[PDB]
Design an enzyme around this catalytic site. Structure first.
Site, PDB file in Angstrom:
ATOM      1  N   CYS C 150       0.836  -1.209   0.000  1.00  0.00           N
ATOM      2  CA  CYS C 150       0.000   0.000   0.000  1.00  0.00           C
ATOM      3  C   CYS C 150       0.880   1.274   0.000  1.00  0.00           C
ATOM      4  O   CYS C 150       0.633   2.227  -0.708  1.00  0.00           O
ATOM      5  CB  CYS C 150      -1.057  -0.020   1.169  1.00  0.00           C
ATOM      6  SG  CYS C 150      -0.453  -0.570   2.823  1.00  0.00           S
ATOM      7  N   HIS C 177       1.146   5.653   9.481  1.00  0.00           N
ATOM      8  CA  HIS C 177       0.360   4.565   8.955  1.00  0.00           C
ATOM      9  C   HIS C 177      -0.656   4.068   9.980  1.00  0.00           C
ATOM     10  O   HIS C 177      -0.346   3.931  11.171  1.00  0.00           O
ATOM     11  CB  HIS C 177       1.291   3.436   8.543  1.00  0.00           C
ATOM     12  CG  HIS C 177       0.694   2.467   7.572  1.00  0.00           C
ATOM     13  ND1 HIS C 177      -0.290   1.570   7.922  1.00  0.00           N
ATOM     14  CD2 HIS C 177       0.976   2.229   6.270  1.00  0.00           C
ATOM     15  CE1 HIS C 177      -0.609   0.836   6.869  1.00  0.00           C
ATOM     16  NE2 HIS C 177       0.149   1.213   5.853  1.00  0.00           N
TER      17      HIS C 177
HETATM   18  N1  LIG Z   1      -4.212  -4.186   5.489  1.00  0.00           N
HETATM   19  C1  LIG Z   1      -3.626  -3.370   4.631  1.00  0.00           C
HETATM   20  O1  LIG Z   1      -3.745  -2.127   4.710  1.00  0.00           O
HETATM   21  C2  LIG Z   1      -2.813  -3.970   3.513  1.00  0.00           C
HETATM   22  C3  LIG Z   1      -2.632  -3.220   2.366  1.00  0.00           C
HETATM   23  C4  LIG Z   1      -1.881  -3.723   1.338  1.00  0.00           C
HETATM   24  C5  LIG Z   1      -1.403  -5.013   1.442  1.00  0.00           C
HETATM   25  N2  LIG Z   1      -1.613  -5.788   2.543  1.00  0.00           N
HETATM   26  C6  LIG Z   1      -1.096  -7.154   2.548  1.00  0.00           C
HETATM   27  O2  LIG Z   1      -2.133  -8.028   2.155  1.00  0.00           O
HETATM   28  C7  LIG Z   1      -2.020  -9.279   2.872  1.00  0.00           C
HETATM   29  C8  LIG Z   1      -3.266  -9.519   3.685  1.00  0.00           C
HETATM   30  O3  LIG Z   1      -3.403  -8.444   4.646  1.00  0.00           O
HETATM   31  P1  LIG Z   1      -4.737  -8.165   5.475  1.00  0.00           P
HETATM   32  O4  LIG Z   1      -4.621  -6.846   6.199  1.00  0.00           O
HETATM   33  O5  LIG Z   1      -5.902  -8.301   4.592  1.00  0.00           O
HETATM   34  O6  LIG Z   1      -4.687  -9.344   6.532  1.00  0.00           O
HETATM   35  P2  LIG Z   1      -5.807 -10.097   7.359  1.00  0.00           P
HETATM   36  O7  LIG Z   1      -5.184 -10.639   8.612  1.00  0.00           O
HETATM   37  O8  LIG Z   1      -6.939  -9.140   7.586  1.00  0.00           O
HETATM   38  O9  LIG Z   1      -6.318 -11.230   6.362  1.00  0.00           O
HETATM   39  C9  LIG Z   1      -5.647 -12.490   6.199  1.00  0.00           C
HETATM   40  C10 LIG Z   1      -6.706 -13.532   5.945  1.00  0.00           C
HETATM   41  O10 LIG Z   1      -6.079 -14.746   5.472  1.00  0.00           O
HETATM   42  C11 LIG Z   1      -6.734 -15.842   6.067  1.00  0.00           C
HETATM   43  N3  LIG Z   1      -5.837 -16.989   6.009  1.00  0.00           N
HETATM   44  C12 LIG Z   1      -4.771 -17.244   6.830  1.00  0.00           C
HETATM   45  N4  LIG Z   1      -4.096 -18.323   6.510  1.00  0.00           N
HETATM   46  C13 LIG Z   1      -4.770 -18.814   5.402  1.00  0.00           C
HETATM   47  C14 LIG Z   1      -4.548 -19.932   4.576  1.00  0.00           C
HETATM   48  N5  LIG Z   1      -3.580 -20.833   4.788  1.00  0.00           N
HETATM   49  N6  LIG Z   1      -5.383 -20.117   3.531  1.00  0.00           N
HETATM   50  C15 LIG Z   1      -6.381 -19.248   3.342  1.00  0.00           C
HETATM   51  N7  LIG Z   1      -6.701 -18.174   4.064  1.00  0.00           N
HETATM   52  C16 LIG Z   1      -5.846 -18.005   5.083  1.00  0.00           C
HETATM   53  C17 LIG Z   1      -7.079 -15.367   7.472  1.00  0.00           C
HETATM   54  O11 LIG Z   1      -8.100 -16.171   8.067  1.00  0.00           O
HETATM   55  C18 LIG Z   1      -7.524 -13.920   7.185  1.00  0.00           C
HETATM   56  O12 LIG Z   1      -8.921 -13.829   6.919  1.00  0.00           O
HETATM   57  C19 LIG Z   1      -0.737  -9.177   3.686  1.00  0.00           C
HETATM   58  O13 LIG Z   1       0.326  -9.758   2.940  1.00  0.00           O
HETATM   59  C20 LIG Z   1      -0.585  -7.667   3.884  1.00  0.00           C
HETATM   60  O14 LIG Z   1       0.768  -7.270   4.031  1.00  0.00           O
HETATM   61  C21 LIG Z   1      -2.282  -5.259   3.594  1.00  0.00           C
END
Ligand SMILES: NC(=O)c1ccc[n+]([C@@H]2O[C@H](COP(=O)([O-])OP(=O)(O)OC[C@H]3O[C@@H](n4cnc5c(N)ncnc54)[C@H](O)[C@@H]3O)[C@@H](O)[C@H]2O)c1
Ligand SMILES: NC(=O)c1ccc[n+]([C@@H]2O[C@H](COP(=O)([O-])OP(=O)(O)OC[C@H]3O[C@@H](n4cnc5c(N)ncnc54)[C@H](O)[C@@H]3O)[C@@H](O)[C@H]2O)c1
Ligand SMILES: NC(=O)c1ccc[n+]([C@@H]2O[C@H](COP(=O)([O-])OP(=O)(O)OC[C@H]3O[C@@H](n4cnc5c(N)ncnc54)[C@H](O)[C@@H]3O)[C@@H](O)[C@H]2O)c1
Ligand SMILES: NC(=O)c1ccc[n+]([C@@H]2O[C@H](COP(=O)([O-])OP(=O)(O)OC[C@H]3O[C@@H](n4cnc5c(N)ncnc54)[C@H](O)[C@@H]3O)[C@@H](O)[C@H]2O)c1
Ligand code: NA
Ligand code: NA
Ligand code: NA
Ligand code: NA
Lengths: 334, 335, 334, 334
Positions: C150, C177
């Site tokens: 992001c 952030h």
């Molecule tokens: N939150 C942000 O602002 C943001 C922005 C850009 C990128 N990201 C990236 O995106 C990714 C996800 O972030 P997020 O904030 O959505 O996290 P999150 O913790 O909200 O979501 C992760 C999801 O993955 C699921 N999960 C875990 N292990 C799994 C598996 N083996 N198979 C399937 N599902 C599984 C969990 O149950 C959860 O619902 C990360 O790599 C993060 O760095 C986050």
């Protein structure tokens, strides 16, 4: 045709009463007074909202007006409500929402400038109304009224359903309430409510409220049967009522649920008292216009005569919408 | 005897604060700590800085397998499985079971396999349940695995005890407005067993379930079935409050209730456990207050002499952690 | 006709990608895997959102699918990506947004299940893309790519404009952030990042980010010219980049503002890089789909060669829309 | 013996200057003025502090005084400082911490009531002092001085060290800053600073600060070489400076750490500028009396001419201690 409204105090309630007025064609705001705002500042206040999101619509201003979706709204400028020329702009109802003129002695001053009626957006020593509960008791001789508190608007429909169906022997109310403008960001003066001056975002803060006593003003049969208090907690909006009652008639949980559900579908309470059986939390009611949403799954009982009912309310949005409802309702009464 | 030797399993909010409090008293010492997510080096950092209870003042050092606190070595263990922990090897008498994942007797009893003598679960559990000042004297020496109830039960039960003994509680309904804890996420996230509990902690009022009020009927048996309750989690970092609505058998004026609480707070039985205030307090005023329960007379209200709402505050972290040590000290005397 | 998408990891990004997918007719989500969610739990997760508000459509579920506005979407609950039956549901792209498969080796396991391409929702040892900046550099042999972070998606377009107009000699970035799922609510273990374990809602927390170094991966000429850091602060969503630059060529404030404004209207950056000259704060960007909004009033300079540019980003919603944009962009490349 | 002090404005700074004054025997507060507090309310505000914890001593009051640890401190209630009878209470220094008399002429009004000298607890166009940096430039004709802002007191020692060791060519500063009393809890009016009106607890808010320019006055050779700005974020206390500067003489990270460390151990800066190499977060500085703590691990450089220095400050506690330090220091000069 439309009910023409002036707003005094273009604050959280004032501005959201304004926004709501844009979404219905029976009521319109034609003049605004706020001694802390210029028209260009008002436009900024309308456009952006931490809680209720960005305004979508055209915003312009002149030296003495704002222009919203192409419609001119006059911007007044007087600290003293006695000096507001509401009559010049054919204002029928003034929404008194400064938070500092909640006494009849003060709110009536709007009449001097030719407003016809005043609705105080707070408890006041005036006739008190809650939509769905006692708004039909309004009398046309009443030129200054109030729409009670947000908490009263949440509690009263809940109490009405409980009392009518089961009979409230006695009740104790707690409300867990979002922060409001009355609280400071840091420990600061608040000479009439000491606890209320403590840093709002970093404390659970007990507060007095008169909502549960006040319910006797809108449901006379409950006079003296309820009392309550409040905890202010660090959320930006949405509050919740926790009403613990002894009931006269035994009620199964199912029967309470069914009474709330029925009530929410009734003509009287439709849109005012809502029902949920979902796993909700407070943010789920941001911009929900209900006065009250009964939370089926969070509400509990010890036995068939002793229950704790939980009801949610967007203290900003629901109340603002009720202010307009009360104006519409009472405007037909001349 | 001279000092009860304690091992901590789960060096979390409760574990570390039990540790800090143990340093302030000479009758107990922590001699071993197990936390599967920490090194000795990391443990020192955890002890040193605390967002809520401030910085540790004292000397902190570590080795490969120990931390050294004010010159005293504390053994750092490393086992995911409690059945594997060599507690007896380190002369650990009591284990504080504070991981949050071994609250079943079936798990917590495993500390005995390694030679711990007794186990105190830092949570409600299917074991004898205790609240200091209310039923710790019901402890029997055969009770090898016990629990110290919840923070909420520790706040509610002293209040209930005072009301019940003075006026008799016919029935009560409890709400606790509760600080966030480690079991809640910072953003909307999965919580398969408690859906609401998965919602963003810092940005919601969250209804939550609690057996605290029913649990009061276990620590005060004549109240079994007479109380129940629930919780709202709100965005504060620590300190919680109990809101008990009850019907009393005998009449109680506000003054009587005020006097009963005050007298209780002065009694040997409740001193330091149940406190009294008539000041205009808010939650942060109880940060690092070691009480289990502070009765708020100004916030407490009533409708009449038989129907009252009593308000009581608790530092859910610090009061509880101190009661764990009190429970250990108290029960250690019973053999 | 329409790019079919599978989502692995139905978290903040996963669910908001899904919501975004409903608003465009060129992509659709036909399968969702999340090991922590039943179909019943999944629609709860969609229905209510603390940040982006309640879902406005209709949700139902079965034992094996969710039904969103009447459209059935198959639901899975399999831990190992290599075991996901993407092919059977004709998934073309997999959004890998679990947060735990951010390596080529892991994320590639999806192709074994019959997915054709994978977009990792995070930095990874894969080709890295930022919409508006290097997405036309995509090559059809790249079956596993990532959409950067992001913060990179916020910084890269701002950097591009500055570098292309004036030349960035050197840049030092700070991002303030919002909290994310990687931080705990109380002081907790975080073995790899000690500060990152501290109570998220009650601290300003320095954090390491790779974003400024990363921009060399999407803007090669800036490789080695940027580095930076982050402070996590207690907001639930929306972050801001603070980029301090020495410029090679002189730039007046006006020239910077107008370069950013022009960029914001270009087809290259439209909807990606936006412009504001209003008195905005972070909540004004909640649900703003921009990668980056240049803040003209907040940006300052000491002189024509030394500037601090401020750019807002909804780290959830901006990025999620960019994931769909990248899928759309690259799908055209066969 | 002791310097007798009056406090005008018993707010966050007022009350904490007061608490700090109890911990040292060379200064004593003998009179306090706050128009929003009775003596009774005053001891409540001392007794309980959301940030800095409970007052450990015992408090009582009369109709005109508070009694702190058995000592009477006179309580005044005058809105107009020229009406404050400081001389009657043998007040030498007035701490002007209302936030509304930050001008030469307004702060000088305390002299009319017989105060000998005034320290404004804020930026003002008066002689400006930062302990450790220029307090020895005080001259006795300076009867109205100021102790700069909290941010200036953090930044100046940092700049002094960089500039003395490496030479600052230019610098841009951001401070990520805790909420203060100037911000409201909900979107409210702030006519002179629109963003500053937005709900404090729920926004990252760009704000202006003159701290960087001010450092140019306290360290004259830095005049015109620094400017900066702020982001207000939702924390209750403790702030952090993020100084991005260009150095004349190249410097390694090691040389910067060593300069900061040496400075922290110097007579000049001991207790004022501190050094850490630990993984700290903002709450770790709550009730840390330092003006500035250089954070070696969080500070970064792009190259040897281009660095980003991170320094922490408890904006309430460090500053309040500096106020007393400045009074002690200047009192010696007659
Ligand atoms: N939150 C942000 O602002 C943001 C922005 C850009 C990128 N990201 C990236 O995106 C990714 C996800 O972030 P997020 O904030 O959505 O996290 P999150 O913790 O909200 O979501 C992760 C999801 O993955 C699921 N999960 C875990 N292990 C799994 C598996 N083996 N198979 C399937 N599902 C599984 C969990 O149950 C959860 O619902 C990360 O790599 C993060 O760095 C986050
Ligand atoms: N906020 C809520 O949740 C809520 C809900 C129901 C009722 N209320 C009540 O509504 C009233 C207003 O509350 P609020 O939250 O909107 O307050 P607010 O502080 O947000 O708004 C008050 C507004 O009045 C303006 N004002 C002050 N003095 C004025 C004067 N002399 N003339 C004109 N304008 C003046 C202020 O500039 C401000 O814009 C209070 O009585 C409050 O108790 C609030
Ligand atoms: N925080 C409170 O207010 C509070 C109050 C009273 C009781 N409790 C209870 O105490 C328990 C712990 O609560 P907390 O807030 O301290 O939790 P926490 O999450 O802060 O601490 C749990 C600790 O256990 C460690 N751990 C996890 N698995 C482990 C294993 N296999 N072996 C060893 N260590 C392991 C984690 O690394 C962490 O340090 C829970 O049962 C909780 O309900 C909490
Ligand atoms: N809060 C900080 O971190 C901080 C740090 C350094 C400097 N300052 C500065 O110090 C000053 C005070 O800040 P604060 O946070 O203590 O504010 P505050 O709002 O907490 O305190 C100001 C006090 O002045 C009182 N007051 C107002 N008008 C008065 C009058 N006419 N006569 C007497 N008392 C009056 C108010 O009742 C209040 O108690 C401001 O200039 C601020 O910029 C603040
Ligand atoms: Na209308
Ligand atoms: Na000890
Ligand atoms: Na679609
Ligand atoms: Na002193």
């Amino acid at each position: 045709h439309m009910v023409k409204i002036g707003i005094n105090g273009f604050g959280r309630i004032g501005r959201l009463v304004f926004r709501a007025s844009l979404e219905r064609t029976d009521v319109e705001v034609v003049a605004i007074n706020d001694i802390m705002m210029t028209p260009e500042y008002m436009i900024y206040m309308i456009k952006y909202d931490t809680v209720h999101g960005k305004f979508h619509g055209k915003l312009e201003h002149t030296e003495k007006s704002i222009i919203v979706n192409g419609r001119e709204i006059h911007v007044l400028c007087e600290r003293d409500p006695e000096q507001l020329p509401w009559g010049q702009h054919n204002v029928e109802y003034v929404v008194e929402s400064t938070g500092i003129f909640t006494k009849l002695d003060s709110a009536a001053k709007h009449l001097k400038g030719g407003a016809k009626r005043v609705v105080i957006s707070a408890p006041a020593d005036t006739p008190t109304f809650v939509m769905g509960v006692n708004n039909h008791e309004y009398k046309p001789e009443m030129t200054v009224i109030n729409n009670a508190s947000c908490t009263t608007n949440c509690l009263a429909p809940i109490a009405a359903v409980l009392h009518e169906n089961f009979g409230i022997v006695e009740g104790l109310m707690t409300t867990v309430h979002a922060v409001t403008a009355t609280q400071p960001t840091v420990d600061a003066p608040s000479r009439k409510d000491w606890r209320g001056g403590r840093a709002a975002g970093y404390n659970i803060i007990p507060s007095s409220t008169g909502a549960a006593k006040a319910v006797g003003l809108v449901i006379p049969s409950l006079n003296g049967k309820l009392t309550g208090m409040a905890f202010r907690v660090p959320t930006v909006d949405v509050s919740v009522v926790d009403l613990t009652c002894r009931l006269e008639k035994p009620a199964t949980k199912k029967q309470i649920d069914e009474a709330m559900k029925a009530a929410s579908e009734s003509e009287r309470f439709k849109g005012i008292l809502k029902f949920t059986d979902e796993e909700v939390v407070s943010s789920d009611f941001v911009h929900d216009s209900a006065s009250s949403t009964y939370d089926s799954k969070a509400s509990i009982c010890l036995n068939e005569h002793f229950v704790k009912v939980v009801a949610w309310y967007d203290n900003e949005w629901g109340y603002s919408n009720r202010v307009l409802d009360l104006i519409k309702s009472t405007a037909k009464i001349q």
